[PDB]
Design a protein around this nucleic acid. Structure first.
Ligand code: CL
Ligand code: CL
Ligand code: CL
Ligand code: CL
Ligand code: CL
Ligand code: K
Ligand code: MG
Ligand code: MG
Ligand code: MG
Ligand code: MG
Ligand code: MG
Ligand code: MG
Ligand code: MG
Ligand code: MG
Ligand code: MG
Ligand code: MG
Ligand code: MG
Ligand code: MG
Ligand code: MG
Ligand code: MG
Ligand code: MG
Ligand code: MG
Ligand code: MG
Ligand code: MG
Ligand code: MG
Ligand code: MG
Ligand code: MG
Ligand code: MG
Ligand code: MG
Ligand code: MG
Ligand code: MG
Ligand code: MG
Ligand code: MG
Ligand code: MG
Ligand code: MG
Ligand code: MG
Ligand code: MG
Ligand code: MG
Ligand code: MG
Ligand code: MG
Ligand code: MG
Ligand code: MG
Ligand code: MG
Ligand code: MG
Ligand code: MG
Ligand code: MG
Ligand code: MG
Ligand code: MG
Ligand code: MG
Ligand code: MG
Ligand code: MG
Ligand code: MG
Ligand code: MG
Ligand code: MG
Ligand code: MG
Ligand code: MG
Ligand code: MG
Ligand code: MG
Ligand code: MG
Ligand code: MG
Ligand code: MG
Ligand code: MG
Ligand code: MG
Ligand code: MG
Ligand code: MG
Ligand code: MG
Ligand code: MG
Ligand code: MG
Ligand code: MG
Ligand code: MG
Ligand code: MG
Ligand code: MG
Ligand code: MG
Ligand code: MG
Ligand code: MG
Ligand code: NA
Ligand code: NA
Ligand code: NA
Ligand code: NA
Ligand code: NA
Ligand code: NA
Ligand code: NA
Ligand code: NA
Ligand code: NA
Ligand code: NA
Ligand code: NA
Ligand code: NA
Ligand code: NA
Ligand code: NA
Ligand code: NA
Ligand code: NA
Ligand code: NA
Ligand code: NA
Ligand code: NA
Ligand code: NA
Ligand code: NA
Ligand code: NA
Ligand code: NA
Ligand code: NA
Ligand code: NA
Ligand code: NA
Ligand code: NA
Ligand code: NA
Ligand code: NA
Ligand code: NA
Ligand code: NA
Ligand code: NA
Ligand code: NA
Ligand code: NA
Lengths: 237, 7
RNA sequence: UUGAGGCGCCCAAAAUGAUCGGGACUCAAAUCCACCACCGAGACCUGUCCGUACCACUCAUACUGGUAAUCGAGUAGAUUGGCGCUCUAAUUGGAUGGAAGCAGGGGCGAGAGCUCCUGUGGACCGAUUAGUGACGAAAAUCCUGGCCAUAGUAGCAGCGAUAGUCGGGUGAGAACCCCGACGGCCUAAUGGAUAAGGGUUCCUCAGCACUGCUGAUCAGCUGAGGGUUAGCCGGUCCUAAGUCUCACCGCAACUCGACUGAGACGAAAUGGGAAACAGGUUAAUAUUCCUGUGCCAUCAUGCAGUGAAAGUUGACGCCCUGGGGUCGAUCACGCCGGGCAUCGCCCGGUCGAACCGUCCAACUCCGUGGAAGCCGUAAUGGCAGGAAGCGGACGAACGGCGGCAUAGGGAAACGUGAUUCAACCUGGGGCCCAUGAAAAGACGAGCAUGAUGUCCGUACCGAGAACCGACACAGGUGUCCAUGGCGGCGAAAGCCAAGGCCUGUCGGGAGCAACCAACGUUAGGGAAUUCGGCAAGUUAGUCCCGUACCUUCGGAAGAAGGGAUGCCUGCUCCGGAACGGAGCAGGUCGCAGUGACUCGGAAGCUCGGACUGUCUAGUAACAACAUAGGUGACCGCAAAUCCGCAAGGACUCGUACGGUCACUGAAUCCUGCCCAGUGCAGGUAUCUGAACACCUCGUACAAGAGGACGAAGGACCUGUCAACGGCGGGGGUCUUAAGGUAGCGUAGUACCUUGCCGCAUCAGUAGCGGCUUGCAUGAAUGGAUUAACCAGAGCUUCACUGUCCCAACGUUGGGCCCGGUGAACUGUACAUUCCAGUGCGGAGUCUGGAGACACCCAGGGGGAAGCAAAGACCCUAUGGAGCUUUACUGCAGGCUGUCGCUGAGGACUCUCACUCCGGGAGGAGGACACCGAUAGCCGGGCAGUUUGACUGGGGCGGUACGCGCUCGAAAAGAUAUCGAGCGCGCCCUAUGGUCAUCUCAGCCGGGGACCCGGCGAAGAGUGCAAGAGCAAAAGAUGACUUGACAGUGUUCUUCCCAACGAGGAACGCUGACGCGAAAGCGUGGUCUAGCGAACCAAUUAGCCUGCUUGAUGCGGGCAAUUGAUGACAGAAAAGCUACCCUAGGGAUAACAGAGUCGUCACUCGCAAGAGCACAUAUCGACCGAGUGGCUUGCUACCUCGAUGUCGGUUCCCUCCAUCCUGCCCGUGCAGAAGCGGGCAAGGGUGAGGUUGUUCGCCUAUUAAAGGAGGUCGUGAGCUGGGUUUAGACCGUCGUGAGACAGGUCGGCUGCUAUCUACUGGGUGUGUAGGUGUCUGACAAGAACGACCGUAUAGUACGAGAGGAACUACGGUUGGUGGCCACUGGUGUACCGGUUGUUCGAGAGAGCACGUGCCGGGUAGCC
RNA sequence: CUUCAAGGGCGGGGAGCCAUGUGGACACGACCCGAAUCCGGACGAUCUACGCAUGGACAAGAUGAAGCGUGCCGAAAGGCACGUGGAAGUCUGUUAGAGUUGGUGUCCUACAAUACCCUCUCGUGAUCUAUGUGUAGGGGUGAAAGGCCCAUCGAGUCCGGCAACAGCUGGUUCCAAUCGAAACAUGUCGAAGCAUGACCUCCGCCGAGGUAGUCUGUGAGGUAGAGCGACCGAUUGGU
């Protein structure tokens, strides 16, 4: 047959890429030799095209102007701080070690210094639970307990724009416009509606998958479609 | 090739 | 009275025109028995010749003589002698006193071919012999070239752009080249400016051979010249998506490849951007040249300035909106110029830049002020955190104002105000799960004077002739002019300017016929048309009133329905006002007031999809795709998923409110049961599970054999169905897990089926509702349902109407005639055909007849199985491709063990390689991971292939695919079919072998056991089909035995004849045995079935052999046994294709023809029976005999280089087995009404409802509403509803692709007529100059068919009820021919009314599609 | 050679080698043409699909969402009326522009290798459009039709492999003389083909019989017919 859609994707052509040339800023934590003496003032609040959520512009003491993954409640004028001694308020970024347990955190680092990886979507937030001289236990937004180095820096508060998913798109046109700002091919045609040549589910006189939808993890790309390595399906039982 | 000549 | 025979008669019906070949024939020209004489082949006889064979002579196959009664046909094919062509060689010739070739002609040869004469030609050409070979053509839908018919034919008409006419000019020549007038056409274009693209097409002169749909003096044509001028318009510069180069890395390698780093490239209308305006000028350029005026940049000098880089700008989305404001447009008045002439109107003009200077509204801010309710807006809004007011800072236009300008421009005047206001300027509000470039550059940052400002583009077209489309192509092709006038909501129609054009480039003629394209109008009726209202029509603008069901409360809704509508006079209200809007009163015309134009028909029921959206460029726009919404799956990012060979990359400037992978498909009510199979996932005592290392054996090593350990995986267990899918039979459990819940239901799913009932209609295979046992409904393979939406499918109603009854007339372009231009398709040949026949069964050409004088014009297309296409259907080929899968085999990829990198101290620590995070310091990780190598598992993701043959086509079924018997099989042998009966793929250590003893079934008699006797040639038994053999045995009993032995042959068979293997059998030999007294018997079973190659392995005994050589190991070989290929003389092997493709086949199916006639239709013979009695008024079984060729079936003859389907339609001919009509017979015939039959084909046999239907069902009429043939008549006539392509849905089946003798929505109809045929029209020839009038061989007709009524008569008849006829009349219907006084239609002749617009008004006209609309209408045609 | 043995197989009493012509076989293009493939390297996104960059386009009218305002009612929450406002994959619309339902009209050697006319759909958005740019062939692109990738698509185009192979259709050119078939048997993935036989022809050899007809003799045979108290099995009735 022909490569299925998932295979055209990898090639990274236009249709499948994100309009990076239209993105504002690779939101990443600042760096500080140490001390923590760093702090800047919120200058503006902008819309981040890449995440359909607001981001805050900031000017630091050393005259450094950069956009920041904004938590909720951060307004212009506000003064944020980034360092080991940074105050324990919303908006400030500091190593989990200095953050008190039970505090909602966002934009957490996987490895200290990576500048943030976890919890960065609209309104999500991690949860610092356990402290240790060795491990800091964070409960990610997926509900998973993540064991992190207490040296991994993170921002206090929950990500801004929460509740964005509550309103339906209502019409194709609204998806269209949003989709156009992401690295995604849209709309979606179901395999079952295609020709056998184009997808493992294609063909037939009527529309239905030609085999059970649950595919093996070891399946080769081109054949791995439907329910990937499903531990189970359905809602019952 | 499509029924009546040549539809 | 009866028997037999000959000839005939009855029985006896078919489709264009009857037949024995025809004419025709009757004491025959028939038939039968004899007889006579003739005709009639290439046979037979005979003369001569030829060939072939043989004989004699001969070197001879040279002659000569002889023989053939026993020689003379021939496709494929074998054999053999010869002719012709090129060039070489030897020998030898001809030619300018004329070679070759060519044309015509003479002679020879059976012939291929040779040769001569004449003319042409003007320089080469042969013969013999031996060679040579790109050596001989009628053919291949053969190739190239040329040419004829076609044919003076089609096209030069069709397009909402119908365009011209009269004078004249130039000229050899003028319909189309030019001037004028008149008449028109184009209005987002047919005008103006341009991008791309073209590339000289631009201008001028000279031309017409080419090109131009005709002509040309003209030209985008030909030829020669000429033409494009920039500091301030573009390019150039900047950066965009993105691109390239170098470096680095990869790769076997590169002209290859991702990242990273650096550099460069990337915008001419239309991104950003230093600067130019006005006039004049040329045949052609022009913000470029010239005149005037202005501006920018850089540098130089001088003065000022020390500021100088922070900031601003460049620089930005979508929707709504206010304010400022120019051009334009219009209004008022003045001036200049024109026009008009009944008035006093109408048109044009009334100018003047860049730039310099200056003005500033909005926004923001400041002071003052001091609002507790005020300020403000179109709207939102604003304020003690300080509102209004006042004052002020900053601050706009491509705008105003002044200059510019006793510049420029105008014949002149060379205005002033106003409204609405494009451009341009500046604000306010709203939206985003969407956030709406960047860089160079400018500003910030003065002034004078001078210098410099190069390089490239610049013509023209920019399209119904300069571009792409082969064309001067009705197609395609971007931007700006969106503000010209009336009109009106309008960038709409219609009409008209400016500007453009008469080149969407052939004309002339006929009241101009048929026929065709577009179209107008048609009385009465009104969907009767048709698959279907297809096509057309109706409605229509604006205001007022008014508005149902349902509904998601938005909608439905312009529901529906009703009324109004002009002009004129005088006014009111809103507003600053409009040349804006809303109303009032009065007057008044028309058939008509949105008077043209513009401009919805409406309502309901059902189905589908929620909606807008998407799609098969070029037959499908749909119910298909998408969608929001619902759900499931995967993943914590060093992730899941995906790309790359690698170096590396997309997702990702992303992070679970993410994004990947799938399913379902808005809302609403809901979404039952099943984990057995399959899939996915988790677990796992135990079982199974590879390689490395390890243990044993083996080998001086090694190959190799085995063991131990055991990963993923599997077994096993569990979870899971919004995962593939499943939800029955039976009974009051069974398969295989469950056994169909809510719902829905004859469904786009229901075979039966037009289901039953109801609605509706005269009538309803339709539609709707109810029922519903559901062939074969049903829950995210989503079920039910649903407002809104729809070029979706079905149905009903009102309205409307030429769709129809049933056609007519008209309009324009063709058609027809004439001038000019000028193709193509097609062509074996012949060709005036017709009716029949025959023939490979579908003939212009054969056969028999008939008909037929030639040529030409027009027509509609009957035939040439017409033209066009090597049939798509079907089969076949050891053809192709796309697709599928638990087909065969492999290849990626994933998982997993192991080895290397790889290090220190069956679980564990560390750090040092290696990895990752980090700017670094350092942190995490860590001998793992990554990478290289290997092993096991998963593995249609991908690749290559296979998937047999036989067959009354193929498939399914079957195996007649290897064997045996009887019959078929025709008394030797051989012998077919999917022929008839039926078997074999073993079994047996005895069921083999020998010997001894013995005789069986069955029956009878005596004491179904046993015992005795008798009869008993064979019916018993002998392993198994069948057929055959056998009795002191081949059978039975008993005993003994292992010959069912080794080796090697002969022969037959397998395979008749007649080659062919394995296998089988018969008969020997050698060896060794058994039994018997012995002869002898035993080469398995009494005979014919019980079977298997090569390679490879194992096995038996002996030997041969392995690369200089010895030893050991391990190999190679001679002989043979065993292991299987049953498709059985041996491949290792599944499907779909409707997305299809190719080679072919009528070797083979579907359609039609043809043969057949079981089937079907009809008849006849006999006449049981019933018909109250009575076979025969009527009905009529059984059985028997037939005719037809409508049905079906069979066959496979014809066509697969195509003979276009079903149904319908239109139009023509026919058949009789007759429905009606006429004339008759019988009657269970009183009459009337019927029932049955006979002759008979003249005429008739109609209209509608469901259905694509044919068929059939139903309604009302009727004299009756018959059936059938013509290629199931009729697609070079129509239609296209159905079957039967490509899309899609449902049910069923399938793992799947996909299928269906299931249903359903959608789905392109080609061609200019040569021949023949006919309808009509002419020109000639024949009869052999003329005018007029006739005749009538033959030819055509349906020219007439039928019905109702009245008198007869309430009569005959009859108890009555009821109720005729002859005849004479009147009328109707269908058909036919003709005609127009009458009625009716038309009537773009004509006359009138009237809307919009233009000519100033009036008058009088043009346009509104070939009449603007409306009203009337003559002739003619109907 | 096999072999106790026997019996078999192959070979043996000197003819070859070379040359030239010619018949035929096998491999190769193999007498010639004839088709759908398969594979390699290249050239195409001037068409079209999808994306991206930078620009442009949408007369006029209709409906009237939120928000806001005024008035009335209310203790309040709020409600009602009127106005304002101007929302919408909203409506009408040949505005421009886009699309393509019916006529199964015209055309169908066309104006045109997809046109013309009328009718019809959309027309503020998932909109339309110019230019620039990206994706390339078992690969793209695809709101999915196997659609599209320059009149080319169930795997583009060009050239090459290449004179592909075919058991399938078509064709294969001068004269004469002699002989003269087979359309059958066996085997075959074989039945549209081959091989081996039968059969046709040619050559060398052998050397006296041969046997298509008839008669007779010595033999083989169970078909026609017939018949069945002759088997066998069917098939009537009566005392
Ligand atoms: Cl999303
Ligand atoms: Cl000769
Ligand atoms: Cl330019
Ligand atoms: Cl405002
Ligand atoms: Cl009637
Ligand atoms: K055929
Ligand atoms: Mg980032
Ligand atoms: Mg995108
Ligand atoms: Mg979808
Ligand atoms: Mg499909
Ligand atoms: Mg597949
Ligand atoms: Mg579905
Ligand atoms: Mg087809
Ligand atoms: Mg002969
Ligand atoms: Mg000589
Ligand atoms: Mg020939
Ligand atoms: Mg003609
Ligand atoms: Mg005209
Ligand atoms: Mg001239
Ligand atoms: Mg010119
Ligand atoms: Mg550049
Ligand atoms: Mg520009
Ligand atoms: Mg010019
Ligand atoms: Mg110019
Ligand atoms: Mg032209
Ligand atoms: Mg009428
Ligand atoms: Mg009807
Ligand atoms: Mg009818
Ligand atoms: Mg219509
Ligand atoms: Mg007023
Ligand atoms: Mg239905
Ligand atoms: Mg829809
Ligand atoms: Mg199409
Ligand atoms: Mg459509
Ligand atoms: Mg269509
Ligand atoms: Mg969804
Ligand atoms: Mg759908
Ligand atoms: Mg019903
Ligand atoms: Mg369910
Ligand atoms: Mg489905
Ligand atoms: Mg063919
Ligand atoms: Mg087929
Ligand atoms: Mg294939
Ligand atoms: Mg890194
Ligand atoms: Mg495959
Ligand atoms: Mg077959
Ligand atoms: Mg015999
Ligand atoms: Mg024996
Ligand atoms: Mg083998
Ligand atoms: Mg063995
Ligand atoms: Mg065989
Ligand atoms: Mg055999
Ligand atoms: Mg074919
Ligand atoms: Mg045949
Ligand atoms: Mg025909
Ligand atoms: Mg009769
Ligand atoms: Mg008749
Ligand atoms: Mg027919
Ligand atoms: Mg008929
Ligand atoms: Mg016809
Ligand atoms: Mg036709
Ligand atoms: Mg025609
Ligand atoms: Mg149809
Ligand atoms: Mg239909
Ligand atoms: Mg249909
Ligand atoms: Mg007119
Ligand atoms: Mg191959
Ligand atoms: Mg392009
Ligand atoms: Mg309002
Ligand atoms: Mg809309
Ligand atoms: Mg519209
Ligand atoms: Mg398909
Ligand atoms: Mg010959
Ligand atoms: Mg001869
Ligand atoms: Mg007999
Ligand atoms: Na399927
Ligand atoms: Na011959
Ligand atoms: Na000014
Ligand atoms: Na106007
Ligand atoms: Na002309
Ligand atoms: Na729409
Ligand atoms: Na299961
Ligand atoms: Na399971
Ligand atoms: Na079901
Ligand atoms: Na639509
Ligand atoms: Na009409
Ligand atoms: Na004809
Ligand atoms: Na294919
Ligand atoms: Na096979
Ligand atoms: Na044998
Ligand atoms: Na018959
Ligand atoms: Na044919
Ligand atoms: Na028909
Ligand atoms: Na008759
Ligand atoms: Na026919
Ligand atoms: Na027809
Ligand atoms: Na047709
Ligand atoms: Na191939
Ligand atoms: Na392109
Ligand atoms: Na309101
Ligand atoms: Na159309
Ligand atoms: Na390809
Ligand atoms: Na080639
Ligand atoms: Na082949
Ligand atoms: Na064959
Ligand atoms: Na044969
Ligand atoms: Na065969
Ligand atoms: Na003799
Ligand atoms: Na006989």
């Amino acid at each position: 047959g022909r490569r299925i859609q998932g295979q055209r994707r990898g090639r990274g052509t236009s249709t499948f890429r994100a309009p990076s040339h239209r993105y504002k800023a690779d939101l990443e934590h600042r760096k500080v030799e140490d001390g923590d003496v760093i702090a800047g003032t919120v200058v503006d609040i902008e819309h981040d095209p890449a995440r359909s959520a607001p981001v805050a512009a900031v000017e630091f003491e050393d005259g450094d102007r950069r956009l920041i993954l904004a938590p909720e409640g951060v307004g212009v004028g506000d003064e944020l701080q980034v360092g080991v001694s940074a105050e324990i308020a919303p908006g400030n970024t500091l190593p989990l070690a200095e953050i008190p347990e039970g505090v909602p955190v966002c934009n957490v680092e996987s490895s200290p210094g990576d500048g943030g990886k976890f919890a960065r979507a609209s309104g999500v937030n991690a949860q610092l639970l356990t402290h240790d001289r060795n491990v800091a236990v964070v409960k990610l937004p997926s509900g998973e307990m993540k064991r992190l180095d207490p040296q991994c820096r993170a921002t206090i508060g929950v990500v801004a724009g929460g509740g964005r998913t509550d309103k339906p798109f209502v019409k194709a046109g609204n998806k269209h416009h949003k989709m156009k700002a992401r690295g995604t091919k849209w709309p979606n045609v179901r395999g079952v509606a295609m020709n056998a040549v184009d997808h493992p589910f294609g063909g037939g006189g009527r529309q239905h998958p030609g085999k059970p939808k649950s595919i093996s993890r070891n399946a080769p790309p081109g054949r791995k479609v439907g329910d990937i390595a499903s531990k189970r399906t359905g809602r019952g039982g | 090739x499509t029924x009546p000549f040549x539809x």
